[PDB]
Amino acid sequence: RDESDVIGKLNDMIEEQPTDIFLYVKLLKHHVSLKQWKQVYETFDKLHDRFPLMANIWCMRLSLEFDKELDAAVIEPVLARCLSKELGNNDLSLWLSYITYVRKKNDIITGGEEARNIVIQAFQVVVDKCAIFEPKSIQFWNEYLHFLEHWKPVNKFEEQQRVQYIRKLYKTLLCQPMDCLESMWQRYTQWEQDVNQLTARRHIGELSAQYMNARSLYQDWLNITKGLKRNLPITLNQATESNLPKPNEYDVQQLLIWLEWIRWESDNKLELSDDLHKARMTYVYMQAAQHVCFAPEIWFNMANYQGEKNTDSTVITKYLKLGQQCIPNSAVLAFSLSEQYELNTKIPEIETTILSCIDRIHLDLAALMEDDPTNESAINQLKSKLTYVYCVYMNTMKRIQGLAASRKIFGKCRRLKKLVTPDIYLENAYIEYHISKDTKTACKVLELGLKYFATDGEYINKYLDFLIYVNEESQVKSLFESSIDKISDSHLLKMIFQKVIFFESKVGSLNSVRTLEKRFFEKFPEVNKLEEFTNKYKVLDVNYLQRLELDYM
Amino acid sequence: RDESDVIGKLNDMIEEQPTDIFLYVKLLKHHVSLKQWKQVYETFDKLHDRFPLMANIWCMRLSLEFDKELDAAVIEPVLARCLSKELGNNDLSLWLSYITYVRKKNDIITGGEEARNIVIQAFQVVVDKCAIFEPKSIQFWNEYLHFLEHWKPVNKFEEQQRVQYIRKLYKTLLCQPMDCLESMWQRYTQWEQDVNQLTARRHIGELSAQYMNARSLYQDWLNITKGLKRNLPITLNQATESNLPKPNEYDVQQLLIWLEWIRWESDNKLELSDDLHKARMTYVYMQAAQHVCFAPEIWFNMANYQGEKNTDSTVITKYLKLGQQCIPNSAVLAFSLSEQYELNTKIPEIETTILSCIDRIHLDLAALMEDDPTNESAINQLKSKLTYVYCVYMNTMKRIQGLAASRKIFGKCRRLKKLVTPDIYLENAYIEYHISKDTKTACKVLELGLKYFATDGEYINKYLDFLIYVNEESQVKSLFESSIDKISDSHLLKMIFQKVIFFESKVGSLNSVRTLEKRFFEKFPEVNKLEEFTNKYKVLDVNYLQRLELDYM
């Protein structure tokens, strides 16, 4: 409960959903309008720490600085961070901002020789790292050709150097699948018959084939990439609630396109070297991790792809962790991280990363129960998710630290009462039963779960399976007899009667079997007697009476 | 190896397939042509003992006698047997033969008073037991009306008695669904306005409604009964290989019609009394048991229907046993009989009836393996059937007589080598494991089965399930590692890799899990990594990662 201090309410919301980028954007517009730059930079740093590879966000910080000469004391540290070697962003909009700053900082008119070379070095690094990969790159290539073309060769060396860069620019670009291809080739052909009428024919002719290939490959990309959307805002003011993903959200259709683009590249149709193919794949993965950033599959496929190639036992962990920063409630990434930590003997990290996911889910569940308390289905899914992760967590700690640890974990779930689901009880009975094949402790856990779930046909079903599985004959019939009028909707109830009857027939009585059948034909008239008799005599789950004798059934 | 004595070869074939009626027919035509009547009667008695309720066969014996005056010393004992109270046939062709003999034996011209009454008593017993039930009965009714109509009333009593029988005949027949309805009603209306013009109107009018009902009910019967076939031969010479079923054979389409006719009658649409409804149902059941005599379902439904109604703990056993005489290799009837014997404390009968089925299957299997040795699929089904019945037999004797008995039974299957199937081994390991939850004895049974089935993906699959189920961690991986190149066609192999990986992940190693995965991605490229990761983390058979997090999968 704050008063009427916007900054306080904003940070509270951010704290609740630290992955909701629009919330930071709002807090940033607010600090910017009040000119409180220390907080603006503090707010951005919070974003960068969590979303290091979201190039669009870095574009927002740089653009904010450009709009107000160019102070290098502020801009270079930022460029150094976002273009660093370990957390290196590789996005055309960010590179275009990079080039823009290099150009403004190295005046070609007033700096001559060294200047042109620095700028040209800039363009070439954008070329080698990104432009030969991104097919929607015409703005970049155009800007670089025009720069080289606009160069006034002073002396004879510069003159020879210019024609070289220009021919290097063309040969590089015209070989990859791109959107400027048809047009860049008209300018290349006119240009070769301009620099030398003798050599045109064989220069134009030495590319020719690779250019047709590039053009057809670009067509396939166009087909695959059909409705691909890339509209993340690159400026603070252009950010809206709509062009930024809400926590955990991603358009599955968009995800499928990224995965297909990546699948089309995994093939190395351009026949690049090992290192260039890897760089091309990496560029596309990073493009996807940026646009469907909340899709666990993209981070999972990326981390494994990176770690595949070469050694460095840290690589897979690195990308899974970036992914978890984006989706902290992701069980896929928590379990993946868990495997890597265990693989690298970072045992403490195993429990810590699992608890992290568990705590984030607990926050989602409490928020969902208070915010839309009537949404019974979403509340039930979340309870299930929470329970599931406690299950894997319990099984994992039993295996890694022993019975006493799994017991404490089960205790915490027992105290959450009906916040959790039946599964944690069933999974705990199995852990208890397998210590020495004793039934006492386990049966008590399941009896205790009955206090909360006796009305749950699904719990009763699996509880019966555990009893059969542990072979506690008398209990099987007891639980059933006692659950018959408690179980929700037939389907499971029909299926359970069959489970019990079959078991009791394997363990005689016949009188038991017979009455259990009487009530069965009472609760479910219209059930074919012979068909049910045939089910009762299954061996290893195969209804042989039907298969070998009552074929028409 | 006989010489050239037909009687010897014939009896050998009969002995091999005692349910093949045409074989007896051939042996009967042969004894009849050589006039060896002692053997003819011996041959028929063999048939009657096995097929007591096959009315058509009794018709064959009677017809054979009629064709040659009428010797009562021979005919009445036969009529007494087939129309007896316990094994009573109720079929129009047999009743028509009965009436024919009563008529020939009680001359109405030369015997007057008592004669007519005896004959009329005959017709009425056919009427009460069969004709008010069988809708294809016009020949019968016609013969009885014509008899009464042809009666020359001598005095005034006979005159009044005649009009009474005739009106009783009409009121009985015109109320049931039959094929003579439309026509019998034209003769009834003309007849009432013939015996009394004053009373016609109200007699004709008191039936009227019931007659329309009967006519519409007959139409439904016609619809249900569409292609129903009833062509069993009623005479020796009319019998062919085609109008008599071959061992175990029945047209499933015919069976479905009988069951539907019976289902249409189970309703009591005619609103008959308890006793009359039961007699109507019984008549139709017996008609079915005669025409699809090798359908286990007809005997099974009949025995239970009969035993339902009233007490007499012997009724269900009675009909199941007739059914087993028709289909001795039927496991459905052997198991059904087994339950009744146990229910009635006839414990010895349990094992005897099961061994009976087992021995008959052994005879079928040996005959199938020698007679068409290339039919691998039919040989494999029969081996499976044999094994299945040994399985139920073993489980039943363990339960009824103990571990030593089930052990002897398993020993007999172990000595049949590859005549049996993997199932008997798996079912025996479970019996062994559940004595005291020890693994030693059971594991040895399965290792021994590996000597015959290591190449059987289905055995390996279930063997792995038993190991997981018994939690023998090291063996699970051993068996798998050792079965990978032995298992037939993927499908099961893919499924098994997943089974093992999941188990090993529940029981750590990660290194084990990891390599087991390496080989898995080697043997099955194109398997989605994330999807497989998601399977590895299932809890209680539910892929929660997919369900709660990777929904689009």
PDB file of N, CA and C in Angstrom, chain B residues 32-94:
ATOM      1  N   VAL B  32     -25.360 -98.089 -42.976  1.00  0.00           N
ATOM      2  CA  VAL B  32     -26.715 -98.276 -43.493  1.00  0.00           C
ATOM      3  C   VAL B  32     -26.717 -99.046 -44.817  1.00  0.00           C
ATOM      4  N   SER B  33     -25.767 -98.754 -45.699  1.00  0.00           N
ATOM      5  CA  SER B  33     -25.728 -99.447 -46.983  1.00  0.00           C
ATOM      6  C   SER B  33     -25.310-100.912 -46.808  1.00  0.00           C
ATOM      7  N   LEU B  34     -24.605-101.217 -45.730  1.00  0.00           N
ATOM      8  CA  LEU B  34     -24.184-102.583 -45.491  1.00  0.00           C
ATOM      9  C   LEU B  34     -25.157-103.251 -44.526  1.00  0.00           C
ATOM     10  N   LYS B  35     -26.243-102.541 -44.213  1.00  0.00           N
ATOM     11  CA  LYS B  35     -27.280-103.001 -43.286  1.00  0.00           C
ATOM     12  C   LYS B  35     -26.780-103.391 -41.875  1.00  0.00           C
ATOM     13  N   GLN B  36     -25.643-102.853 -41.446  1.00  0.00           N
ATOM     14  CA  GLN B  36     -25.119-103.179 -40.121  1.00  0.00           C
ATOM     15  C   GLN B  36     -25.749-102.262 -39.054  1.00  0.00           C
ATOM     16  N   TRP B  37     -27.045-102.432 -38.833  1.00  0.00           N
ATOM     17  CA  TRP B  37     -27.780-101.590 -37.908  1.00  0.00           C
ATOM     18  C   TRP B  37     -27.269-101.451 -36.486  1.00  0.00           C
ATOM     19  N   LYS B  38     -26.592-102.460 -35.968  1.00  0.00           N
ATOM     20  CA  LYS B  38     -26.081-102.313 -34.619  1.00  0.00           C
ATOM     21  C   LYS B  38     -25.113-101.106 -34.621  1.00  0.00           C
ATOM     22  N   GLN B  39     -24.195-101.065 -35.590  1.00  0.00           N
ATOM     23  CA  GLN B  39     -23.231 -99.969 -35.689  1.00  0.00           C
ATOM     24  C   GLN B  39     -23.889 -98.639 -36.042  1.00  0.00           C
ATOM     25  N   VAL B  40     -24.946 -98.669 -36.853  1.00  0.00           N
ATOM     26  CA  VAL B  40     -25.673 -97.431 -37.188  1.00  0.00           C
ATOM     27  C   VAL B  40     -26.179 -96.780 -35.884  1.00  0.00           C
ATOM     28  N   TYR B  41     -26.848 -97.570 -35.054  1.00  0.00           N
ATOM     29  CA  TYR B  41     -27.378 -97.089 -33.790  1.00  0.00           C
ATOM     30  C   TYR B  41     -26.254 -96.702 -32.841  1.00  0.00           C
ATOM     31  N   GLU B  42     -25.127 -97.420 -32.896  1.00  0.00           N
ATOM     32  CA  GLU B  42     -23.982 -97.082 -32.050  1.00  0.00           C
ATOM     33  C   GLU B  42     -23.395 -95.716 -32.481  1.00  0.00           C
ATOM     34  N   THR B  43     -23.363 -95.491 -33.802  1.00  0.00           N
ATOM     35  CA  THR B  43     -22.844 -94.257 -34.349  1.00  0.00           C
ATOM     36  C   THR B  43     -23.761 -93.094 -33.960  1.00  0.00           C
ATOM     37  N   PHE B  44     -25.060 -93.236 -34.184  1.00  0.00           N
ATOM     38  CA  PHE B  44     -25.998 -92.192 -33.762  1.00  0.00           C
ATOM     39  C   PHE B  44     -25.874 -91.879 -32.249  1.00  0.00           C
ATOM     40  N   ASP B  45     -25.812 -92.909 -31.403  1.00  0.00           N
ATOM     41  CA  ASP B  45     -25.702 -92.698 -29.950  1.00  0.00           C
ATOM     42  C   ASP B  45     -24.450 -91.869 -29.580  1.00  0.00           C
ATOM     43  N   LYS B  46     -23.364 -92.079 -30.306  1.00  0.00           N
ATOM     44  CA  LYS B  46     -22.172 -91.286 -30.080  1.00  0.00           C
ATOM     45  C   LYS B  46     -22.526 -89.804 -30.346  1.00  0.00           C
ATOM     46  N   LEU B  47     -23.220 -89.529 -31.445  1.00  0.00           N
ATOM     47  CA  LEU B  47     -23.640 -88.163 -31.788  1.00  0.00           C
ATOM     48  C   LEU B  47     -24.538 -87.553 -30.709  1.00  0.00           C
ATOM     49  N   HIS B  48     -25.560 -88.314 -30.263  1.00  0.00           N
ATOM     50  CA  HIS B  48     -26.520 -87.846 -29.261  1.00  0.00           C
ATOM     51  C   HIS B  48     -25.868 -87.547 -27.946  1.00  0.00           C
ATOM     52  N   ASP B  49     -24.868 -88.333 -27.600  1.00  0.00           N
ATOM     53  CA  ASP B  49     -24.196 -88.118 -26.341  1.00  0.00           C
ATOM     54  C   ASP B  49     -23.470 -86.775 -26.331  1.00  0.00           C
ATOM     55  N   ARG B  50     -22.928 -86.394 -27.484  1.00  0.00           N
ATOM     56  CA  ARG B  50     -22.179 -85.162 -27.617  1.00  0.00           C
ATOM     57  C   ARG B  50     -23.071 -83.994 -27.966  1.00  0.00           C
ATOM     58  N   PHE B  51     -24.026 -84.232 -28.866  1.00  0.00           N
ATOM     59  CA  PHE B  51     -24.963 -83.192 -29.349  1.00  0.00           C
ATOM     60  C   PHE B  51     -26.420 -83.497 -29.003  1.00  0.00           C
ATOM     61  N   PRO B  52     -26.720 -83.627 -27.697  1.00  0.00           N
ATOM     62  CA  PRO B  52     -28.067 -83.930 -27.220  1.00  0.00           C
ATOM     63  C   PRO B  52     -29.184 -83.028 -27.681  1.00  0.00           C
ATOM     64  N   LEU B  53     -28.889 -81.745 -27.857  1.00  0.00           N
ATOM     65  CA  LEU B  53     -29.904 -80.777 -28.271  1.00  0.00           C
ATOM     66  C   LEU B  53     -29.930 -80.413 -29.772  1.00  0.00           C
ATOM     67  N   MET B  54     -29.243 -81.189 -30.606  1.00  0.00           N
ATOM     68  CA  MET B  54     -29.228 -80.945 -32.072  1.00  0.00           C
ATOM     69  C   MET B  54     -30.460 -81.658 -32.589  1.00  0.00           C
ATOM     70  N   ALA B  55     -31.592 -80.984 -32.592  1.00  0.00           N
ATOM     71  CA  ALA B  55     -32.797 -81.668 -33.003  1.00  0.00           C
ATOM     72  C   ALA B  55     -32.674 -82.252 -34.405  1.00  0.00           C
ATOM     73  N   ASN B  56     -31.977 -81.558 -35.306  1.00  0.00           N
ATOM     74  CA  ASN B  56     -31.892 -82.065 -36.667  1.00  0.00           C
ATOM     75  C   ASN B  56     -31.385 -83.486 -36.734  1.00  0.00           C
ATOM     76  N   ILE B  57     -30.403 -83.821 -35.901  1.00  0.00           N
ATOM     77  CA  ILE B  57     -29.833 -85.176 -35.874  1.00  0.00           C
ATOM     78  C   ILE B  57     -30.855 -86.237 -35.439  1.00  0.00           C
ATOM     79  N   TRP B  58     -31.682 -85.912 -34.445  1.00  0.00           N
ATOM     80  CA  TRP B  58     -32.710 -86.841 -34.013  1.00  0.00           C
ATOM     81  C   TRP B  58     -33.683 -87.032 -35.211  1.00  0.00           C
ATOM     82  N   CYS B  59     -33.967 -85.956 -35.935  1.00  0.00           N
ATOM     83  CA  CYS B  59     -34.827 -86.045 -37.096  1.00  0.00           C
ATOM     84  C   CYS B  59     -34.206 -87.042 -38.085  1.00  0.00           C
ATOM     85  N   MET B  60     -32.878 -87.082 -38.160  1.00  0.00           N
ATOM     86  CA  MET B  60     -32.247 -88.011 -39.092  1.00  0.00           C
ATOM     87  C   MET B  60     -32.488 -89.445 -38.690  1.00  0.00           C
ATOM     88  N   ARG B  61     -32.361 -89.741 -37.404  1.00  0.00           N
ATOM     89  CA  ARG B  61     -32.572 -91.105 -36.941  1.00  0.00           C
ATOM     90  C   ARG B  61     -34.028 -91.517 -37.118  1.00  0.00           C
ATOM     91  N   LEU B  62     -34.966 -90.648 -36.744  1.00  0.00           N
ATOM     92  CA  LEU B  62     -36.383 -91.001 -36.881  1.00  0.00           C
ATOM     93  C   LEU B  62     -36.750 -91.228 -38.345  1.00  0.00           C
ATOM     94  N   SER B  63     -36.409 -90.279 -39.226  1.00  0.00           N
ATOM     95  CA  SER B  63     -36.700 -90.409 -40.657  1.00  0.00           C
ATOM     96  C   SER B  63     -36.184 -91.733 -41.234  1.00  0.00           C
ATOM     97  N   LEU B  64     -35.013 -92.156 -40.780  1.00  0.00           N
ATOM     98  CA  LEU B  64     -34.408 -93.399 -41.235  1.00  0.00           C
ATOM     99  C   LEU B  64     -35.324 -94.599 -40.866  1.00  0.00           C
ATOM    100  N   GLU B  65     -35.999 -94.493 -39.723  1.00  0.00           N
ATOM    101  CA  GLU B  65     -36.877 -95.543 -39.254  1.00  0.00           C
ATOM    102  C   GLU B  65     -38.235 -95.506 -39.941  1.00  0.00           C
ATOM    103  N   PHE B  66     -38.752 -94.309 -40.179  1.00  0.00           N
ATOM    104  CA  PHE B  66     -40.047 -94.138 -40.817  1.00  0.00           C
ATOM    105  C   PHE B  66     -40.031 -94.694 -42.242  1.00  0.00           C
ATOM    106  N   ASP B  67     -38.941 -94.458 -42.967  1.00  0.00           N
ATOM    107  CA  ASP B  67     -38.830 -94.934 -44.349  1.00  0.00           C
ATOM    108  C   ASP B  67     -38.922 -96.454 -44.514  1.00  0.00           C
ATOM    109  N   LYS B  68     -38.863 -97.190 -43.414  1.00  0.00           N
ATOM    110  CA  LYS B  68     -38.935 -98.639 -43.484  1.00  0.00           C
ATOM    111  C   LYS B  68     -40.014 -99.249 -42.584  1.00  0.00           C
ATOM    112  N   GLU B  69     -44.716-100.147 -42.444  1.00  0.00           N
ATOM    113  CA  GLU B  69     -45.295-100.098 -41.098  1.00  0.00           C
ATOM    114  C   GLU B  69     -44.413 -99.245 -40.175  1.00  0.00           C
ATOM    115  N   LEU B  70     -44.664 -99.274 -38.858  1.00  0.00           N
ATOM    116  CA  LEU B  70     -43.856 -98.498 -37.887  1.00  0.00           C
ATOM    117  C   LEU B  70     -43.572 -99.276 -36.601  1.00  0.00           C
ATOM    118  N   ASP B  71     -42.347 -99.778 -36.461  1.00  0.00           N
ATOM    119  CA  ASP B  71     -41.962-100.553 -35.278  1.00  0.00           C
ATOM    120  C   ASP B  71     -41.803 -99.705 -34.001  1.00  0.00           C
ATOM    121  N   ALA B  72     -42.788 -99.815 -33.127  1.00  0.00           N
ATOM    122  CA  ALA B  72     -42.791 -99.046 -31.901  1.00  0.00           C
ATOM    123  C   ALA B  72     -41.702 -99.438 -30.915  1.00  0.00           C
ATOM    124  N   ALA B  73     -41.183-100.650 -31.008  1.00  0.00           N
ATOM    125  CA  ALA B  73     -40.158-101.070 -30.078  1.00  0.00           C
ATOM    126  C   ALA B  73     -38.878-100.282 -30.259  1.00  0.00           C
ATOM    127  N   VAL B  74     -38.688 -99.778 -31.476  1.00  0.00           N
ATOM    128  CA  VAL B  74     -37.506 -99.015 -31.839  1.00  0.00           C
ATOM    129  C   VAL B  74     -37.689 -97.504 -31.718  1.00  0.00           C
ATOM    130  N   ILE B  75     -38.850 -97.039 -32.166  1.00  0.00           N
ATOM    131  CA  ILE B  75     -39.154 -95.623 -32.197  1.00  0.00           C
ATOM    132  C   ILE B  75     -39.476 -94.903 -30.897  1.00  0.00           C
ATOM    133  N   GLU B  76     -40.194 -95.561 -29.994  1.00  0.00           N
ATOM    134  CA  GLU B  76     -40.570 -94.888 -28.752  1.00  0.00           C
ATOM    135  C   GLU B  76     -39.384 -94.661 -27.825  1.00  0.00           C
ATOM    136  N   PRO B  77     -38.452 -95.613 -27.724  1.00  0.00           N
ATOM    137  CA  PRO B  77     -37.338 -95.298 -26.822  1.00  0.00           C
ATOM    138  C   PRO B  77     -36.607 -94.015 -27.311  1.00  0.00           C
ATOM    139  N   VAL B  78     -36.465 -93.886 -28.634  1.00  0.00           N
ATOM    140  CA  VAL B  78     -35.808 -92.727 -29.249  1.00  0.00           C
ATOM    141  C   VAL B  78     -36.613 -91.447 -28.974  1.00  0.00           C
ATOM    142  N   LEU B  79     -37.933 -91.509 -29.095  1.00  0.00           N
ATOM    143  CA  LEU B  79     -38.754 -90.335 -28.852  1.00  0.00           C
ATOM    144  C   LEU B  79     -38.680 -89.988 -27.362  1.00  0.00           C
ATOM    145  N   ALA B  80     -38.590 -91.027 -26.533  1.00  0.00           N
ATOM    146  CA  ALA B  80     -38.517 -90.810 -25.100  1.00  0.00           C
ATOM    147  C   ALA B  80     -37.187 -90.114 -24.715  1.00  0.00           C
ATOM    148  N   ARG B  81     -36.107 -90.427 -25.419  1.00  0.00           N
ATOM    149  CA  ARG B  81     -34.828 -89.826 -25.116  1.00  0.00           C
ATOM    150  C   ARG B  81     -34.738 -88.354 -25.542  1.00  0.00           C
ATOM    151  N   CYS B  82     -35.072 -88.092 -26.808  1.00  0.00           N
ATOM    152  CA  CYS B  82     -34.966 -86.753 -27.381  1.00  0.00           C
ATOM    153  C   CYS B  82     -36.033 -85.768 -26.915  1.00  0.00           C
ATOM    154  N   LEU B  83     -37.166 -86.279 -26.436  1.00  0.00           N
ATOM    155  CA  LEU B  83     -38.219 -85.403 -25.906  1.00  0.00           C
ATOM    156  C   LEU B  83     -38.282 -85.488 -24.359  1.00  0.00           C
ATOM    157  N   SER B  84     -37.256 -86.085 -23.748  1.00  0.00           N
ATOM    158  CA  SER B  84     -37.181 -86.218 -22.277  1.00  0.00           C
ATOM    159  C   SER B  84     -37.303 -84.870 -21.549  1.00  0.00           C
ATOM    160  N   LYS B  85     -37.458 -84.917 -20.236  1.00  0.00           N
ATOM    161  CA  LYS B  85     -37.602 -83.693 -19.466  1.00  0.00           C
ATOM    162  C   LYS B  85     -36.315 -82.892 -19.285  1.00  0.00           C
ATOM    163  N   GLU B  86     -35.172 -83.551 -19.093  1.00  0.00           N
ATOM    164  CA  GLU B  86     -33.937 -82.795 -18.907  1.00  0.00           C
ATOM    165  C   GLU B  86     -33.286 -82.365 -20.235  1.00  0.00           C
ATOM    166  N   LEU B  87     -33.140 -83.289 -21.177  1.00  0.00           N
ATOM    167  CA  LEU B  87     -32.525 -82.958 -22.465  1.00  0.00           C
ATOM    168  C   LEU B  87     -33.596 -82.848 -23.505  1.00  0.00           C
ATOM    169  N   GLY B  88     -34.576 -81.980 -23.280  1.00  0.00           N
ATOM    170  CA  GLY B  88     -35.698 -81.880 -24.208  1.00  0.00           C
ATOM    171  C   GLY B  88     -35.622 -81.026 -25.461  1.00  0.00           C
ATOM    172  N   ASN B  89     -35.650 -81.657 -26.624  1.00  0.00           N
ATOM    173  CA  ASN B  89     -35.574 -80.896 -27.857  1.00  0.00           C
ATOM    174  C   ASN B  89     -36.903 -80.270 -28.141  1.00  0.00           C
ATOM    175  N   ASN B  90     -36.849 -79.061 -28.650  1.00  0.00           N
ATOM    176  CA  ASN B  90     -38.054 -78.343 -28.929  1.00  0.00           C
ATOM    177  C   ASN B  90     -37.877 -77.667 -30.279  1.00  0.00           C
ATOM    178  N   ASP B  91     -38.081 -78.461 -31.332  1.00  0.00           N
ATOM    179  CA  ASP B  91     -37.924 -78.035 -32.716  1.00  0.00           C
ATOM    180  C   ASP B  91     -39.099 -78.505 -33.594  1.00  0.00           C
ATOM    181  N   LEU B  92     -39.687 -77.599 -34.379  1.00  0.00           N
ATOM    182  CA  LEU B  92     -40.832 -77.981 -35.233  1.00  0.00           C
ATOM    183  C   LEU B  92     -40.673 -79.186 -36.169  1.00  0.00           C
ATOM    184  N   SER B  93     -39.486 -79.376 -36.735  1.00  0.00           N
ATOM    185  CA  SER B  93     -39.273 -80.499 -37.629  1.00  0.00           C
ATOM    186  C   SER B  93     -39.310 -81.795 -36.835  1.00  0.00           C
ATOM    187  N   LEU B  94     -38.821 -81.753 -35.598  1.00  0.00           N
ATOM    188  CA  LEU B  94     -38.826 -82.962 -34.775  1.00  0.00           C
ATOM    189  C   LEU B  94     -40.269 -83.192 -34.264  1.00  0.00           C
TER     190      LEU B  94
END
